[PDB]
Design a protein around this ligand. Structure first.
Ligand code: 2W1
Ligand code: 2W1
Ligand code: ZN
Ligand code: ZN
Ligand code: ZN
Ligand code: ZN
Lengths: 305, 305
């Protein structure tokens, strides 16, 4: 509600700030403008949000701050393509984003598999993501926490299906296949948002874009956020070493100095193609791609000196 | 088919040229590229196109050339917003544009009513437009002309209803209310393409935009097309005078030198608002609004001398 936030929350590169106790208010604000005032009962929406907060952990990157950050990117996409999405899709995608990393420990799917963690035996594919969806369902089942109580059953199942597909798509491993399919479909003209499978893929791509949105922030934010990502990655690399396994340089603390190149390779191979394809499908998402290109060239500048 | 045409047909301000016998080929190129090669049985489409041509009259403006010119603007809107349209809209809209002035006599609805022409008794409202649709149905029902023969009964009924509304929407009297409603729906965030009635309204505006597209061409095309518009209009004013009715200045050749002011009034009151509102709803249509603004200046230049 403060004047500066009302204005700057509409910008794609908004940063939600260091005051944790304001992020919940920021979130309800976004869903009030996106969905409307009558979409959720306020008391139980707030109860739901605080439970979701309580179930994110104190890890350097995959934390409560990141959840609210991803939800804001989704908000900025919803508000600049306000004409495309249904009542349920708007409700569902903000909530999905807010819950998409629920109960993350700071470890990748491959570390869970190599450790032989219980979750890996339960979910052979997209381990952490299936857990994220499972957590969000458990939180919905808590007394007083079903923010979708007012929906019909038919509509309730639709929004839970919107949420699971969305959360599963944040598995970056599914992104490469998804982006590639959408590229061929956009170029040939077969792409069609009235086709549910096509729509599901666009939403999948949107989730990636939001998930990766630290690369679309202004340089100082992107740069500082990078410390948090690597602190988490290196901790995992340490744990690989403890299992007797040489981790990839990405996660290896001893290769700090190759970070500038490593990021460069990631922007070219993952980030630019993601927002390039997204901007093609939804042209109003242009500023995300613009800001991505700016950070790419900032990383190029770190290589030189 | 030829190299220059293939490139420049993607531009909003493309002129289809003076060679009548290429226009049908230009139209099939357009449906093949925006719908697909499998949408229509080629032999049936060519028969349909030719007998549609046969039922346009040798009149100064509302002729075959204007039918294909309007289909082209629609094609250009489809290709820059392609992801939004149903398979049925991809088939029906180019047809609707091709057929939207079928059997135009060169006279307004007002003249037909004042003359007491039989059409005025048959269709009290949107007279010529109801006739245009009636004509396109008669042509669809000629042996070998049902280009929609492989559709289901359900699919046939609803593509004809798409065409009906699109053609009816070309009555410029209905545009004012339609645009005013869409403006409020856009401003308040109420507008939504998952609502069928909203979808109809937007298509109606696209229809208005395509029908008026001579204002969105480059100056020399727009200037010369104005000669043809006024040749029809002045012929109607002659005929009004013969009924003992003083015609409005717009259709009075004795008011020739007020044309620039009349054009300027039209751009400010009708054309700019149309493309402005269309660009809000469909941002990739911006080149139309841009060309309209450029022509707005050209008419202001003419006023000055
Ligand atoms: O590609 C790298 C990379 C590393 C981290 C990374 O995470 C992100 N970076 C920026 C924005 C978003 C991310 C997310 C973090 C969470 O999981 C998905 C990626 C990306 C590439 C990378 N390769 C390296 C080789 C040697 C030394 C360092 C290297 N870094
Ligand atoms: O507003 C006029 C006007 C006239 C023609 C007109 O037709 C179009 N002009 C440009 C683009 C498209 C059109 C279409 C033609 C078919 O019917 C819809 C308009 C528009 C305004 C107009 N008012 C006048 C007063 C005195 C003398 C001349 C005047 N002209
Ligand atoms: Zn995740
Ligand atoms: Zn995430
Ligand atoms: Zn007409
Ligand atoms: Zn017309």
């Amino acid at each position: 509600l403060p004047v500066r936030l009302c204005k700057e929350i509409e910008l794609f590169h908004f940063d939600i700030g260091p005051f944790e106790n304001m992020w919940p208010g920021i979130f309800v604000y976004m869903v009030h403008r996106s969905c409307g005032t009558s979409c959720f009962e306020l008391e139980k929406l707030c109860r739901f949000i605080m439970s979701v907060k309580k179930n994110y952990r104190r890890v350097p990157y995959h934390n409560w701050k990141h959840a609210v950050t991803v939800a804001h990117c989704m908000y900025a996409i919803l508000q600049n393509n306000h004409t495309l999405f249904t009542d349920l899709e708007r409700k569902g995608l903000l909530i999905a984003c807010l819950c998409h990393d629920l109960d993350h420990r700071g470890f990748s799917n491959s570390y869970l598999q190599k450790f032989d963690h219980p979750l890996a035996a339960l979910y052979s594919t997209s381990t952490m993501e299936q857990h994220h969806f499972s957590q969000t369902v458990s939180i919905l089942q808590l007394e007083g926490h079903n923010i979708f109580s007012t929906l019909s059953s038919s509509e309730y199942e639709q929004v839970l299906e919107i949420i699971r597909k969305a959360i599963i798509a944040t598995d970056l491993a599914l992104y490469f296949g998804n982006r590639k399919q959408l590229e061929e479909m956009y170029q040939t003209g077969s792409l069609n948002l009235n086709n549910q499978s096509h729509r599901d893929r666009v939403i999948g791509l949107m989730m990636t874009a939001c998930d990766l949105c630290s690369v679309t922030k202004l340089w100082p934010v992107t740069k500082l956020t990078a410390n948090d990502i690597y602190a988490e990655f290196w901790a995992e690399g340490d744990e690989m070493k403890k299992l007797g396994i040489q981790p990839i340089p990405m996660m290896d603390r001893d290769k700090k100095d190759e970070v500038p190149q490593g990021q460069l390779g990631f922007y070219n191979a993952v980030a630019i193609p993601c927002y390039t394809t997204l901007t093609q499908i939804l042209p109003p998402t242009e500023p995300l791609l613009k800001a991505c290109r700016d950070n790419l060239s900032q990383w190029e500048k770190v290589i030189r000196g």
